[PDB]
Design a protein around this ligand. Structure first.
Ligand SMILES: COc1ccc(-c2c(S(C)(=O)=O)ccc(C(=O)c3cnn(C(C)(C)C)c3O)c2C)cc1
Ligand SMILES: COc1ccc(-c2c(S(C)(=O)=O)ccc(C(=O)c3cnn(C(C)(C)C)c3O)c2C)cc1
Ligand SMILES: [Fe+3]
Ligand SMILES: [Fe+3]
Lengths: 364, 364
């Protein structure tokens, strides 16, 4: 839109979850989402600091990290660290998890120059989290505060980060349920205004046009979308999140699927056998009314298939979007996932909206 | 053997894992081990303190617990607690996990009288962890220190604990790979002598007849088996465990299978899709030699099936045992699982031994 990015942003690079045990979370997510085990950085690769496992599905990258006993790297100093992600900190990790529980620590975006991106962001009010560091004279990584204890990590290149080792053979089963990339990453905050002013201030991201108030910030080509909500008192779902999460943090990750019907069949088969659960499906009435609001974009047959899978539908102009939501990913009623597929706008980011019309249509 | 139990022990009741996120660990374990989601105690059941999920497979019960934000129960006091497991403590839980990582907090055994069991144990040198508390005038639970931060929980009745809610319908998929009960729970300690003297001292358990020294303690009917190892310096596998685990703790849980061949086929199918990995199989030579050492108990065909599944075999007198080991359950190279099936002794506990002969046969 006005295209005011203060630095060249390319696209989402990865999402990093800080966990208690990386192995168990990553394996659960791999099976439930159909993401392949692609790379690792841990004791077997010489990393005495943290255990990190990368899952991939198309362009989507989910990183799962947990801290080893500090005792293993007690003789190291930053200049001699065996960690592959220099920003990692045992104390910060444990504190983050103890406070918020399983959740996203970093929303990483690929930029043309992470060093430049960091300096420009800070010059513009971003709170530094981790300075630019050049890994193997090939990749540069830097971090600034986004909201709560969630950071925005900048990654630039001159597969995954150096230090990581590609997973081979049978250790890497080719799971794939259709998920292809991260559409949007939404955060919950107590006060939307200051959060918007802060994030838009350091990145230059423009605004992309109950119980909550929301706003979507987007890069120049609107492919990187960072929405934010705040609660509206007088009980907000966003307020309950803030309480259980102990403050602001990522609310949901919307994952684009090249075939949402296939992704939902595959995910639903695995719900009760190690996978993810979905929220209760809409009533039959929602599908009756769907025939009247999107009848021109989806046949009666495509609508029945949406009903079988509990898929929700909504639309703007230019496009339509199919979406569905999982139940919380872990113990706390905080972070959850959204599976989405957009029809139209030939594709332009945000085609079809974000389903705000479903909040209403669902209640009816 | 001498049958010196100081109180009436019945059998293993459950194993409790203290986690960062109970939901994710429990769902991963459910799928990888084929254990049904049977009961829960969390926000939906009114528990504002902890999230606890029970998985069952035959008589085997695996409990997964994680602490919610203390803020949710900040107005509670022990006399008004909403926790279903009165021994739970946010601080202790977080400390345990931060220190050791994902692992067993409690090895629970059913006794005729948990109050009596606790008092007698303490009179005999057991270090109290949690006093006897009567839940819903129906179940009594008490805890004493076993080793490290692992406690021995006594449970007596007058399904699972009160407060827990049975999982119904589709929320409980009937997974079952053949696992039926807990055979033995082994702990690693720095000094075997004092640990044996301590545990045998308060329970009356009798001794059931490289790099390590081990000893097996057993109840009267030898159905409850609590083995313990210590490292032997001059690098012990047990020493590496102690370092990564930050001290003593449960090393492995041996799970009895009513059909180890079926359990291994099912588990192996799921290894790379959210399940558990197994250690590298024995060489073909191990199976050639197996034909000569157990040829009278297992046909050539049964031996080839053991080779396909990587199952190890060993024997004493009275019986033979089939066993296999998974790779560590979580991030740290600490706790792992053992799948076992015993042939003979018609069944008496410990029939066939524990595979000590395999340590040698494997190296060759
Ligand atoms: C907690 O239970 C839930 C789950 C999903 C929704 C829900 C619904 S519902 C009630 O229909 O199910 C419709 C759209 C969106 C949705 O994902 C969204 C809404 N606005 N935006 C922005 C980008 C503006 C934050 C989104 O990303 C969401 C989260 C609401 C409550
Ligand atoms: C860490 O890698 C491993 C995995 C398994 C074994 C292993 C082997 S191996 C080398 O053949 O694979 C054979 C038997 C047993 C076994 O489970 C055991 C041994 N003694 N006892 C007692 C009860 C006395 C502690 C047991 O419970 C075990 C743990 C050894 C190293
Ligand atoms: Fe969304
Ligand atoms: Fe064993």
């Amino acid at each position: 839109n006005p295209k005011s990015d203060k630095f060249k942003v390319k696209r989402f690079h990865h999402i990093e979850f800080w966990c208690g045990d990386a192995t168990n979370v990553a394996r659960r997510f791999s099976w439930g989402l159909g993401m392949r085990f692609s790379a690792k950085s841990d004791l077997s690769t010489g990393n005495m600091v943290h255990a990190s496992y990368l899952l991939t599905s198309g362009d989507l990258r989910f990183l799962f990290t947990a801290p080893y006993s500090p005792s293993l790297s007690a003789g190291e100093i930053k200049p001699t660290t065996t960690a592959s992600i220099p920003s990692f900190d045992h104390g910060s990790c444990r504190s983050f998890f103890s406070s918020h529980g399983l959740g996203v620590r970093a929303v990483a975006i690929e930029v043309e120059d992470a060093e430049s991106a960091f300096s420009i962001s800070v010059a513009n009010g971003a709170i530094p989290s981790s300075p630019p560091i050049v890994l193997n004279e090939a990749v540069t990584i830097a971090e600034v505060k986004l909201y709560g204890d969630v950071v925005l990590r900048y990654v630039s290149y001159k597969e995954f980060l150096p230090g990581f080792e590609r997973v081979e053979d049978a250790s890497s089963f080719p799971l794939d349920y259709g998920i292809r990339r991260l559409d949007h990453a939404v955060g919950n905050v107590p006060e939307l205004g200051p959060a918007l002013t802060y994030v838009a201030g350091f990145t230059g991201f423009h605004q992309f046009a109950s119980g909550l108030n929301s706003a979507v910030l987007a890069s120049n080509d609107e492919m990187v979308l960072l929405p934010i909500n705040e609660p509206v008192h007088g009980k907000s779902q966003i307020q309950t999140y803030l309480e259980h999460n102990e403050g602001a943090g990522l609310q949901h990750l919307a994952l684009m699927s090249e075939d949402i019907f296939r992704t939902l069949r595959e995910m639903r088969k695995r719900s009760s056998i190690g996978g993810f659960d979905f929220m209760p499906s809409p009533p039959p009435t929602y599908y009756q009314n769907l025939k009247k609001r999107v009848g021109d974009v989806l046949s009666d047959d495509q609508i029945k298939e949406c009903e079988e899978l509990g898929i929700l539908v909504d639309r703007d102009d230019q496009g339509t979007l199919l979406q569905i939501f999982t139940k919380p990913l872990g113990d706390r009623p905080t972070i959850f996932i959204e599976i989405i597929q957009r029809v139209g706008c030939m594709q332009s980011g945000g085609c079809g909206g974000f389903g705000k019309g479903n909040f209403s249509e669902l209640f009816k």
